[PDB]
């Protein structure tokens, strides 16, 4: 029939500011029509790697909920946003499950997220005692204890601060330039699936 | 938990914050160099002070991790690099005195202005006022005046300063568990802890003497030929049996002999390989020069330049309104930012310099995957040697014919190869005894073998013995004749040029054997050869993570610096010089026979 109430993909992709990789934003998308061909046919994305589903049948299938996680990482750290990978981002900042169904979309944002003095507003968790579970968020700012001595809240010897900034400057290499990453997670649950694609007339 | 994991986390935090601070400092230095303005000087000084204070604090914090409880070689290498005191082990008064002495030597060398007595209304600085006179004049007393007046002013200013300098640097070095400052400089080649590939600080002097003993016949024949030609140029001053007069070598100090190519050319009637007019006729921009260099590096299989390289480099002189340093410099600013600062003209020299500096950039790009404190050459010789091999390969007539800059009907006979090899010998072979003699003299000064009242009596004795160059008039101990040169007056190691020269031809033989070149070594071109680039990039990707002996094993298959590739490179010229020196006398006499 006549279709209205599109899913809010404009408030995820065209957001004026993105979150850091550690405090990554999660938006739950429900009870609307999700047109995925608008995203797939865009020329503005550098990575559109879909895991567990193909992009051509996304516009056909129907899902219970869509999770849109948004953050900013480096150019060389986009490869770690994948199932089964390793690195600071996967181990300490944002972990994807091995049984992940969804798409990882990344694009260069050197125009927006880099300033000539250095943009220190984007941070990443550099240390933690254990690796993250999938879809876990750690926003704690407690001093990492690398040694036997207690930190006692002061960043002294062997005690460092967990979150470190990426001083994004426009003159950086393509592996150090900021990349905005949106990860869409598609799950089907026993509830009635309501995020369906548009149906042709 | 364990000390090693603690050191690894400390290195990770170090790396992360260091990379950012080094970037800020390098960008400030770039903005000073492309824009000489006082606020850029202030920003450079602020960034440099922050970088130095951060290195002091991390050196103070790295020492708390003892070395013997760490088994991983790379972690131990980074911790060894970080844990050096430097001048921090010295007292604050003496450290301030040493810094003041270094700065005032820099100002004396940079702002040294000398002109003729009784005509003092205007004077000429060293660059380019005295450089052009030394490189182009044919007058004996004019060159003698310039040489003696510049060593009078500069040496009589710098002699007490250097006497304080040697004592302070020896005090710092013995405070850093070295024998002298010469041992501190030789510690760059020290490899410890690797089975078989260990290299000692004491092995460096023995290897340098052992290689120079094989250098010596080729240099003796070249010296005899240059002596005969300078006797033709200056009829009565030069003796057939004696050393060369010091002020006639084409440069201020005798560092290079490349300004004597006009006087000492074998076959003037034959043409040169100058391609300047050919680029002017085809209207080659400096952008085209760097694009041809990039085409050379992609032909061998190395990665091409980033977009940020073309956006952010200054490859042309900006203009009259904006001032910039004219010296060509390759900048690894950090965070994947690679730039070249060169005021490129349309000449062969600037084209070869573009190849040389892009070789520096390729070397910097290759070890970008390494941790920050391991992002260097394996020693100080490799970093310059990998640029000089590109300068070797690009200068060949096959490369010029391949890129269209030389006529395809250019006749490559033996005479042009002889005079090309002689030009390369005046540049390359002639600097070797001067470099070796200067470093051996500085090592003997730091070791205390030479007392302060006998510095110059030994020095000229060394120059007659090694370089075969005699002083015009005797100098007493009020002179400081070594410190008129840039590197010695500004606290720089000088053995990097000797090691660079030998590593250059070792790398050239290894890559030409990889490229299956079937002719003479100087006729060899490494373009279009993927395997030569792969053999190069295997060493290039290591950086400072591996010992320089193991890197040299990776390229040439030898564990030590070798002299045979250089002698193989100059073998046509060596046979030609042996033929031309039948009537004349090879070797020199240390007596005062030419002039004293
Ligand atoms: C985001 O912005 C681009 C460029 O302005 C636009 O083409 C696109 O339609 C916008 N929305 C989405 C969902 O990408
Ligand atoms: C160089 O510095 C001057 C100083 O005011 C400035 O006006 C100019 O824009 C600078 N040049 C560049 C290329 O930034
Ligand atoms: C040394 O540490 C690095 C990480 O810093 C690791 O990749 C490497 O495998 C280690 N080497 C050894 C021999 O343990
Ligand atoms: C650096 O100096 C301190 C004291 O000045 C000393 O304890 C330390 O051992 C020195 N480091 C090295 C590597 O010698
Ligand atoms: C470098 O080479 C790659 C692959 O050949 C090419 O896509 C890229 O555009 C080149 N870089 C530049 C700056 O031309
Ligand atoms: C060059 O070759 C010719 C013929 O082989 C020979 O007569 C001449 O002497 C050679 N010249 C030199 C400098 O080797
Ligand atoms: C090297 O490769 C380029 C591109 O294929 C080619 O134009 C050039 O002629 C080659 N060099 C030689 C010596 O043939």
Residue with CA closest to ligand 7 atom 4: B299
Respond yes or no: is residue B357 known to be catalytic.
yes
Annotated binding residue B327: yes
CB contact under 8 A, A169 and B335: yes
Distance CA B61, CA B57 (A): 6
DSSP-derived 3-state class of residue B548: helix
B485 DSSP 8-state letter: S
Of A147, A164, A176, the CB nearest to B16: A164
Give the range of the structural domain holding residue A44, as residue numbers without chain letter: 1-117+170-201
Tell me if the bond preceding B128 is cis, omega within 30° of 0. yes
In the DSSP assignment, the letter for residue B237 is T
A36 lines ligand 1 (CB under 6 A): no
Residues A165 and A74 in one domain: no
- Picking from B84, B108, B135, the residue at the C-terminal end of a domain is B84
- Distance CA(A79)–CA(B82), nearest Å, equals 31
Please give the helix or strand (H or E) that residue B469 lies within, else none.
strand B469-470
Domain identity same for A64 and A103: yes
Query: Phi, psi (5° rounding) for residue A6?
Result: -70, 155
Mutation target vs B (from A157, A173, A175, A176; most B CBs, 10 A cutoff): A173
Q: Which two tokens stand for residue B387?
A: 């640029």
Q: Cβ of A169 under 8 Å from any chain B Cβ?
A: yes
Closest of A199, A200, A201, A192 to residue A30, by C-alpha: A192
A113/A126 same-domain check = no
For residue A143, the tally of other CB atoms under 10 A from its CB is 17
Q: What is the dihedral of CA B1, B3, B7, B8, to 10 degrees?
A: -50
Task: Name the closest ligand to CA B311.
Answer: 5
Whether residues A138 and A56 fall in one domain: no
Asked whether residue B538 is domain-assigned, the answer is no
Answer yes or no: are the C-beta atoms of A176 and A75 closer than 8 Å.
yes
Same domain for A158 and A111?
no
Residue B351 lies in a domain: yes
Q: Which two tokens stand for residue B283?
A: 């209207």
**Tokens 């140029």, located at residue:** B233
Q: How far is the CA of B530 from the centre of ligand 7 (A)?
A: 12
Sign of torsion over alpha carbons B456, B459, B461, B463: negative
Q: Which domain holds residue B64?
A: 3-84
Q: Which residues contact B80 (CB under 8 A, 6 or more apart)?
A: B67
3-state secondary structure chain A: CCCCCECCCHHHHCCCCCCECCCCEEEEECCCECCCHHHHCCCCCCEEEEECCCHHHCCCCEECEEEEEEEEECCCCCCCCCCCCCCHHHHHHCCCCCCCCEEEEEEECHHHHCCCCCECCCEEECCCCCCCCCCCCCCCCCCEECCCCCCCCCCCCCEECCEEECCECCCCCCCCCCEEEEEEEEECCCCCCCEECCCCC
Residue of B nearest to A117 (CA): B24
Q: Please, what's the largest Cα pairwise distance for chain A?
A: 69
B459 annotated ligand-binding residue: yes
A144 and A96 within one domain = no
A138 burial via Cβ count (<10 Å: 0-12, 13-18, 19+):
middle
Could you tell me the two tokens for B489?
Answer: 């007056």
Residue A160's region, left for phi above 0, alpha for psi from -120 to 50, else beta, is beta
d(CA B240, CA B521): 33
**Residues A164, A178 within the same domain:** no
Give B61's contacts in chain A (Cβ within 8 Å). Answer: 157
Distance in angstroms (rounded) separating the CA atoms of residues B140 and B137: 8
**Is there a single domain that holds both residue A30 and residue A93?**
yes
Distances (CA, A) of A154 to A157, A163, B205, B217, B248: 9, 15, 50, 67, 67
- Selecting among B292, B357, B380, B439, the annotated active-site residue is B357
Structure tokens at B414: 């033996």
Residues A110 and A122 in one domain: no
Q: Which ligand is nearest to the CA of B9?
A: 3
Q: Would you say B588 is a known binding-site residue?
A: no
Beta carbons of B551 and B378 less than 8 angstroms apart: yes
Q: What approach was used to elucidate this structure?
A: cryo-EM
Residues B4, B8, B14, B15, CA torsion sign = positive
- Please report the atom of ligand 6 found closest to the CA of residue B266: 13
Who among A146, A167, A172 is closest to B336 (CB)? Answer: A172
Q: Which of B153, B487, B531, B571 is catalytic?
A: B487
Same domain, A174 and A157: no
B503 marked as binding residue:
no
Say if residue A78 is in the same domain as residue A145.
no
d(CA B479, CA B147): 13
Domain boundary among B361, B388, B408: B408
CA nearest neighbour of B256 among B479, B23, B426: B426
Instruction: Report the C-alpha gap between A150 and A144 in whole angstroms.
Output: 10
State the distance from the centre of ligand 6 to the C-alpha of B572, rounded, in angstroms. Answer: 11
What is the count of structural domains for chain A?
2
B12 with A174: Cβ contact below 8 A: no
Cβ separation A158–B6 shorter than 8 A: yes
Overall size of chain A counted in residues: 201
- Please name which of B457, B443, B555 lies closest in space to residue B493, comparing C-alpha atoms: B443
Beta strands, E only, B285-413 = 329-334, 337-341
Residue at B76 is within a domain: yes
Other beta carbons less than 10 A from residue A81's beta carbon: 26
Pair A18, A76 in one domain: yes
Angle between helix B548-555 and B530-540 (nearest 10): 170
Pocket test for ligand 7, best of B404, B528, B533 (most atoms within 8 A of CB): B528
Resolution of the experimental model in angstroms, please? Answer: 2.8
List of residues 6+ apart from B492 with CB closer than 8 A: B486
| Count: domains in chain B | 2
Name B127's Cβ contacts closer than 8 Å, sequence gap at least 6: none
3-class secondary structure, B294: helix
Q: Tell me, using a 6 A CB cutoff, whether residue B301 lines ligand 7.
A: no
Test B306 with A126 for CB contact under 8 angstroms.
no
Phi, psi of B485 (to 5 degrees): -95, 155
CA B291 to the chain's CA centroid? 25
B489 domain-assigned: no
Cβ atoms within 10 Å, residue B582: 7
The yes-or-no answer on residue B247 being catalytic is: no
């Amino acid at each position: 029939p006549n279709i209205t109430n599109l899913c809010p993909f404009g408030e995820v992709f065209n957001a004026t500011r993105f979150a850091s990789v550690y405090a990554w934003n999660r938006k739950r998308i429900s009870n609307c029509v999700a047109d995925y061909s608008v995203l797939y046919n865009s020329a503005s994305f550098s990575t559109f790697k879909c895991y567990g589903v193909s992009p051509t049948k996304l516009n056909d299938l129907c899902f219970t909920n869509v999770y849109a996680d948004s953050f900013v990482i480096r150019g060389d750290e986009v490869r770690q946003i994948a199932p089964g990978q390793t690195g600071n981002i996967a181990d300490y900042n944002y972990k994807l499950p091995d049984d992940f169904t969804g798409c990882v979309i990344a694009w260069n944002s050197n125009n927006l997220d880099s300033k000539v003095g250095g943009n220190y507003n984007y941070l990443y968790r550099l240390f933690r005692k254990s690796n993250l579970k999938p879809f876990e968020r750690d926003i704690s700012t407690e001093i990492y204890q690398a040694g036997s001595t207690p930190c006692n809240g002061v960043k002294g010897f062997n005690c460092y601060f967990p979150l470190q900034s990426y001083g994004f400057q426009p003159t950086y290499g393509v592996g150090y330039q900021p990349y905005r990453v949106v990860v869409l997670s598609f799950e089907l649950l026993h509830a009635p699936a309501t995020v369906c694609g548009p149906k042709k007339s | 938990s364990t000390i090693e994991e603690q050191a690894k986390t400390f290195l990770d935090k170090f790396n992360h914050e260091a990379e950012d601070l080094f970037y800020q400092s390098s960008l400030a230095s770039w903005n000073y160099n492309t824009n000489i303005t006082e606020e850029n000087v202030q920003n450079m000084n602020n960034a440099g002070d922050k970088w130095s204070a951060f290195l002091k604090e991390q050196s103070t914090l790295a020492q708390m991790y003892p070395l013997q409880e760490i088994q991983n070689l790379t972690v131990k290498l980074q911790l060894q690099a970080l844990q050096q005191n430097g001048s921090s082990v010295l007292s604050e008064d003496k450290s301030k005195r040493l810094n003041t002495i270094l700065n005032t030597m820099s100002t004396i060398y940079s702002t040294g202005k000398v002109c003729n007595p009784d005509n003092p209304q205007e004077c000429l600085l060293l660059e380019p006022g005295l450089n052009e006179i030394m490189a182009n004049s044919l007058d004996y007393n004019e060159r003698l005046w310039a040489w003696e007046s510049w060593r009078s002013e500069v040496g009589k200013q710098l002699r007490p300063l250097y006497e304080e300098y040697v004592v302070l640097k020896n005090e710092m070095a013995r405070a850093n568990h070295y024998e002298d400052y010469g041992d501190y400089w030789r510690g760059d080649y020290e490899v410890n802890g690797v089975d078989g590939y260990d290299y000692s600080r004491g092995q460096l002097i023995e290897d340098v003497e052992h290689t120079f003993e094989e250098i010596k016949p080729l240099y003796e024949h070249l010296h005899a030929y240059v002596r005969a030609k300078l006797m033709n140029a200056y009829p009565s001053y030069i003796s057939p049996i004696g050393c060369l007069p010091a002020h006639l070598l084409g440069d201020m100090w005798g560092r290079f002999w490349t300004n004597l190519y006009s006087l000492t050319v074998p076959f003037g009637q034959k043409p040169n390989i100058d391609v300047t007019d050919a680029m002017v006729d085809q209207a080659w921009d400096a952008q085209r020069i760097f694009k041809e260099a990039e085409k050379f590096f992609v032909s061998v299989g190395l990665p091409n330049m980033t977009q940020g390289f073309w956006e952010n480099s200054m490859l042309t002189d900006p203009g009259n309104v904006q001032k910039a340093v004219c010296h060509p410099t390759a900048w690894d600013l950090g965070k994947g930012d690679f730039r070249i600062l060169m005021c490129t003209k349309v000449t062969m020299d600037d084209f070869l310099t573009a190849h040389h500096e892009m070789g520096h950039i390729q070397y910097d790009m290759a070890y970008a995957a390494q941790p920050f404190l391991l992002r260097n050459g394996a020693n100080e010789g490799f970093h310059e040697a990998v640029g000089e091999i590109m300068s070797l390969s690009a200068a060949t007539p096959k490369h010029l014919k391949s890129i269209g800059l030389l006529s395809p009907d250019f006749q490559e006979d033996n005479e042009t190869e002889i005079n090309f090899l002689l030009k390369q010998a005046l540049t390359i072979v002639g600097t070797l005894p001067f470099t070796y003699m200067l470093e051996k003299w500085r090592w003997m000064v730091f070791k205390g073998e030479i007392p302060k009242d006998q510095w110059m009596k030994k020095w000229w004795e060394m120059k007659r013995e090694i370089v075969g160059v005699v002083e015009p008039v005797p100098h007493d101990e009020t002179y400081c004749d070594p410190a008129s040169l840039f590197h010695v007056s500004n606290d720089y190691s000088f053995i990097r040029y000797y090691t660079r020269t030998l590593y250059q031809f070792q790398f050239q033989e290894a890559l030409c054997q990889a490229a299956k070149h079937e002719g003479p070594l100087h006729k060899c071109d490494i373009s279009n050869s993927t395997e030569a680039g792969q053999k190069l990039f295997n060493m290039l990707r290591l950086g400072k993570s591996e010992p320089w002996t193991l890197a040299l094993e990776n390229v040439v298959g030898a564990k030590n610096m070798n002299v045979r590739p250089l002698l193989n490179y100059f073998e046509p010229l060596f046979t030609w010089l042996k033929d031309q020196n039948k009537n004349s006398f090879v070797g020199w006499s240390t007596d005062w026979s030419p002039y004293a």
